[PDB]
PDB file of C-alpha atoms in Angstrom:
ATOM      1  CA  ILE A 259      -0.062   0.107  -0.170  1.00  0.00           C
ATOM      2  CA  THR A 260       2.636   2.366   0.898  1.00  0.00           C
ATOM      3  CA  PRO A 261       6.571   2.563   1.166  1.00  0.00           C
ATOM      4  CA  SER A 262       5.695   4.554   4.514  1.00  0.00           C
ATOM      5  CA  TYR A 263       7.812   7.294   5.919  1.00  0.00           C
ATOM      6  CA  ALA A 264      10.347   4.730   7.057  1.00  0.00           C
ATOM      7  CA  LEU A 265      11.440   3.995   3.288  1.00  0.00           C
ATOM      8  CA  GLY A 266      10.519   7.670   2.067  1.00  0.00           C
ATOM      9  CA  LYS A 267      13.401   8.271   4.415  1.00  0.00           C
ATOM     10  CA  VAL A 268      15.618   5.476   3.482  1.00  0.00           C
ATOM     11  CA  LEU A 269      15.351   5.847  -0.237  1.00  0.00           C
ATOM     12  CA  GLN A 270      15.458   9.638   0.052  1.00  0.00           C
ATOM     13  CA  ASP A 271      18.602   9.178   2.049  1.00  0.00           C
ATOM     14  CA  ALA A 272      20.209   7.235  -0.506  1.00  0.00           C
ATOM     15  CA  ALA A 273      19.494  10.290  -2.859  1.00  0.00           C
ATOM     16  CA  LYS A 274      21.343  12.810  -0.473  1.00  0.00           C
ATOM     17  CA  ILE A 275      24.115  10.499  -0.254  1.00  0.00           C
ATOM     18  CA  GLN A 276      24.329  11.036  -4.030  1.00  0.00           C
ATOM     19  CA  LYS A 277      25.294  14.622  -3.835  1.00  0.00           C
ATOM     20  CA  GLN A 278      27.553  13.795  -0.946  1.00  0.00           C
ATOM     21  CA  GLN A 279      29.320  11.314  -3.370  1.00  0.00           C
ATOM     22  CA  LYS A 280      28.900  13.000  -6.590  1.00  0.00           C
ATOM     23  CA  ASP A 281      27.020  10.987  -8.941  1.00  0.00           C
ATOM     24  CA  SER A 282      23.586  11.250 -10.432  1.00  0.00           C
ATOM     25  CA  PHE A 283      22.303   7.720  -9.919  1.00  0.00           C
ATOM     26  CA  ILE A 284      21.868   6.077  -6.510  1.00  0.00           C
ATOM     27  CA  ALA A 285      24.797   3.648  -6.043  1.00  0.00           C
ATOM     28  CA  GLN A 286      23.859   0.296  -4.484  1.00  0.00           C
ATOM     29  CA  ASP A 287      26.386   1.606  -1.642  1.00  0.00           C
ATOM     30  CA  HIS A 288      24.440   4.818  -1.207  1.00  0.00           C
ATOM     31  CA  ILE A 289      21.448   2.938  -0.695  1.00  0.00           C
ATOM     32  CA  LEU A 290      23.203   0.612   1.696  1.00  0.00           C
ATOM     33  CA  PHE A 291      24.161   3.522   3.817  1.00  0.00           C
ATOM     34  CA  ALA A 292      21.003   4.617   4.111  1.00  0.00           C
ATOM     35  CA  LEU A 293      19.655   1.084   5.035  1.00  0.00           C
ATOM     36  CA  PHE A 294      22.545   0.761   7.433  1.00  0.00           C
ATOM     37  CA  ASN A 295      21.629   4.044   9.047  1.00  0.00           C
ATOM     38  CA  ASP A 296      18.164   3.182   9.850  1.00  0.00           C
ATOM     39  CA  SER A 297      18.648  -0.846  10.303  1.00  0.00           C
ATOM     40  CA  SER A 298      18.539  -2.242  13.536  1.00  0.00           C
ATOM     41  CA  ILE A 299      18.159  -5.516  15.219  1.00  0.00           C
ATOM     42  CA  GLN A 300      15.113  -5.233  17.322  1.00  0.00           C
ATOM     43  CA  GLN A 301      15.979  -7.712  20.190  1.00  0.00           C
ATOM     44  CA  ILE A 302      16.067  -6.915  23.886  1.00  0.00           C
ATOM     45  CA  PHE A 303      19.711  -6.303  23.559  1.00  0.00           C
ATOM     46  CA  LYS A 304      19.861  -4.098  20.446  1.00  0.00           C
ATOM     47  CA  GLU A 305      22.340  -5.575  17.878  1.00  0.00           C
ATOM     48  CA  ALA A 306      23.535  -3.345  14.785  1.00  0.00           C
ATOM     49  CA  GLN A 307      25.492  -2.898  11.840  1.00  0.00           C
ATOM     50  CA  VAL A 308      28.952  -1.849  12.191  1.00  0.00           C
ATOM     51  CA  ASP A 309      28.805   2.033  12.359  1.00  0.00           C
ATOM     52  CA  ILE A 310      28.943   4.193   9.067  1.00  0.00           C
ATOM     53  CA  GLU A 311      32.382   4.881   9.861  1.00  0.00           C
ATOM     54  CA  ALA A 312      33.408   1.143   8.832  1.00  0.00           C
ATOM     55  CA  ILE A 313      30.604   1.117   6.304  1.00  0.00           C
ATOM     56  CA  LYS A 314      32.534   4.067   4.609  1.00  0.00           C
ATOM     57  CA  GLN A 315      35.930   2.920   4.911  1.00  0.00           C
ATOM     58  CA  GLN A 316      34.876  -0.331   3.017  1.00  0.00           C
ATOM     59  CA  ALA A 317      32.847   1.880   0.434  1.00  0.00           C
ATOM     60  CA  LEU A 318      36.017   3.673  -0.336  1.00  0.00           C
ATOM     61  CA  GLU A 319      38.154   0.895  -0.052  1.00  0.00           C
ATOM     62  CA  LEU A 320      35.815  -0.917  -2.884  1.00  0.00           C
ATOM     63  CA  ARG A 321      35.501   1.362  -5.990  1.00  0.00           C
TER      64      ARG A 321
ATOM     65  CA  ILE B 148      37.250  34.953   1.203  1.00  0.00           C
ATOM     66  CA  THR B 149      35.870  31.606   0.441  1.00  0.00           C
ATOM     67  CA  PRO B 150      33.981  29.897  -2.833  1.00  0.00           C
ATOM     68  CA  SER B 151      32.200  27.984  -0.157  1.00  0.00           C
ATOM     69  CA  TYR B 152      32.482  24.103  -0.105  1.00  0.00           C
ATOM     70  CA  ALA B 153      30.005  24.669  -2.622  1.00  0.00           C
ATOM     71  CA  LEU B 154      31.975  26.073  -5.374  1.00  0.00           C
ATOM     72  CA  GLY B 155      34.983  24.147  -4.612  1.00  0.00           C
ATOM     73  CA  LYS B 156      33.133  21.045  -4.997  1.00  0.00           C
ATOM     74  CA  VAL B 157      31.021  22.200  -7.950  1.00  0.00           C
ATOM     75  CA  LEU B 158      33.975  23.237 -10.005  1.00  0.00           C
ATOM     76  CA  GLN B 159      36.173  20.310  -9.155  1.00  0.00           C
ATOM     77  CA  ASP B 160      32.870  18.110  -9.787  1.00  0.00           C
ATOM     78  CA  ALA B 161      32.644  19.712 -13.258  1.00  0.00           C
ATOM     79  CA  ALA B 162      36.102  17.992 -13.689  1.00  0.00           C
ATOM     80  CA  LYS B 163      34.666  14.858 -12.801  1.00  0.00           C
ATOM     81  CA  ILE B 164      31.927  15.609 -15.357  1.00  0.00           C
ATOM     82  CA  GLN B 165      34.580  15.677 -17.970  1.00  0.00           C
ATOM     83  CA  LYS B 166      36.201  12.495 -17.124  1.00  0.00           C
ATOM     84  CA  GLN B 167      32.431  10.967 -16.866  1.00  0.00           C
ATOM     85  CA  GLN B 168      31.913  12.685 -20.569  1.00  0.00           C
ATOM     86  CA  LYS B 169      35.832  12.158 -21.791  1.00  0.00           C
ATOM     87  CA  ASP B 170      35.963  15.657 -22.403  1.00  0.00           C
ATOM     88  CA  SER B 171      39.500  17.574 -22.392  1.00  0.00           C
ATOM     89  CA  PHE B 172      38.488  20.809 -20.765  1.00  0.00           C
ATOM     90  CA  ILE B 173      35.662  21.894 -18.245  1.00  0.00           C
ATOM     91  CA  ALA B 174      32.754  23.117 -20.118  1.00  0.00           C
ATOM     92  CA  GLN B 175      29.818  25.365 -19.082  1.00  0.00           C
ATOM     93  CA  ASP B 176      27.844  22.444 -19.588  1.00  0.00           C
ATOM     94  CA  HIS B 177      29.929  20.424 -17.094  1.00  0.00           C
ATOM     95  CA  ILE B 178      29.450  22.922 -14.759  1.00  0.00           C
ATOM     96  CA  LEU B 179      25.847  22.758 -15.008  1.00  0.00           C
ATOM     97  CA  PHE B 180      25.961  18.853 -14.575  1.00  0.00           C
ATOM     98  CA  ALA B 181      28.114  19.841 -11.479  1.00  0.00           C
ATOM     99  CA  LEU B 182      25.454  21.894 -10.202  1.00  0.00           C
ATOM    100  CA  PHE B 183      22.815  19.480 -10.678  1.00  0.00           C
ATOM    101  CA  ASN B 184      24.833  16.914  -8.335  1.00  0.00           C
ATOM    102  CA  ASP B 185      24.929  19.905  -5.810  1.00  0.00           C
ATOM    103  CA  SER B 186      21.899  22.203  -6.619  1.00  0.00           C
ATOM    104  CA  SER B 187      19.882  22.872  -3.519  1.00  0.00           C
ATOM    105  CA  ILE B 188      18.315  26.140  -2.432  1.00  0.00           C
ATOM    106  CA  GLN B 189      17.798  27.157   1.402  1.00  0.00           C
ATOM    107  CA  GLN B 190      14.219  27.114   2.261  1.00  0.00           C
ATOM    108  CA  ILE B 191      11.721  25.299   4.529  1.00  0.00           C
ATOM    109  CA  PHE B 192      10.819  23.442   1.211  1.00  0.00           C
ATOM    110  CA  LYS B 193      14.097  23.495  -0.586  1.00  0.00           C
ATOM    111  CA  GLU B 194      14.367  23.738  -4.483  1.00  0.00           C
ATOM    112  CA  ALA B 195      16.560  21.278  -6.235  1.00  0.00           C
ATOM    113  CA  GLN B 196      17.544  19.834  -9.403  1.00  0.00           C
ATOM    114  CA  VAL B 197      17.364  16.131 -10.311  1.00  0.00           C
ATOM    115  CA  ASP B 198      20.736  14.613  -9.564  1.00  0.00           C
ATOM    116  CA  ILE B 199      22.077  14.344 -12.939  1.00  0.00           C
ATOM    117  CA  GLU B 200      19.559  12.232 -14.981  1.00  0.00           C
ATOM    118  CA  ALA B 201      17.585  14.857 -16.798  1.00  0.00           C
ATOM    119  CA  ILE B 202      21.168  17.051 -17.751  1.00  0.00           C
ATOM    120  CA  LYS B 203      22.436  13.887 -19.326  1.00  0.00           C
ATOM    121  CA  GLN B 204      19.558  14.041 -21.708  1.00  0.00           C
ATOM    122  CA  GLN B 205      19.647  18.057 -21.867  1.00  0.00           C
ATOM    123  CA  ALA B 206      23.287  17.906 -22.968  1.00  0.00           C
ATOM    124  CA  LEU B 207      22.151  15.689 -25.937  1.00  0.00           C
ATOM    125  CA  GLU B 208      19.587  18.569 -26.653  1.00  0.00           C
ATOM    126  CA  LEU B 209      22.200  21.074 -27.249  1.00  0.00           C
ATOM    127  CA  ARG B 210      23.756  21.069 -30.701  1.00  0.00           C
TER     128      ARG B 210
END
């Protein structure tokens, strides 16, 4: 029915990343940053992806 | 005093655009592509251009 605001934020954030990273189309890595920024593991002990600094490290090492 | 982070980035991005198009020198056309990647006008509801999709086509629409 909807992408919700949950993805309005993620998908649009990926677009924001594109300006930061200088390219007209959303890279899989840019959408990965957006996903990772909003992603979480909803358990009693919150778990999460390595923070964005490592994600960026790898996003810079690869391509 | 400064060109802002914004023109620093736009003028250098225009060089990046040369590289995407395989052009020898920065064109005014390239500056416009760089501006599309970084075009955002401060407002509550900000104005902006499409990152780059339309301008690639619009470059073809020039002689």
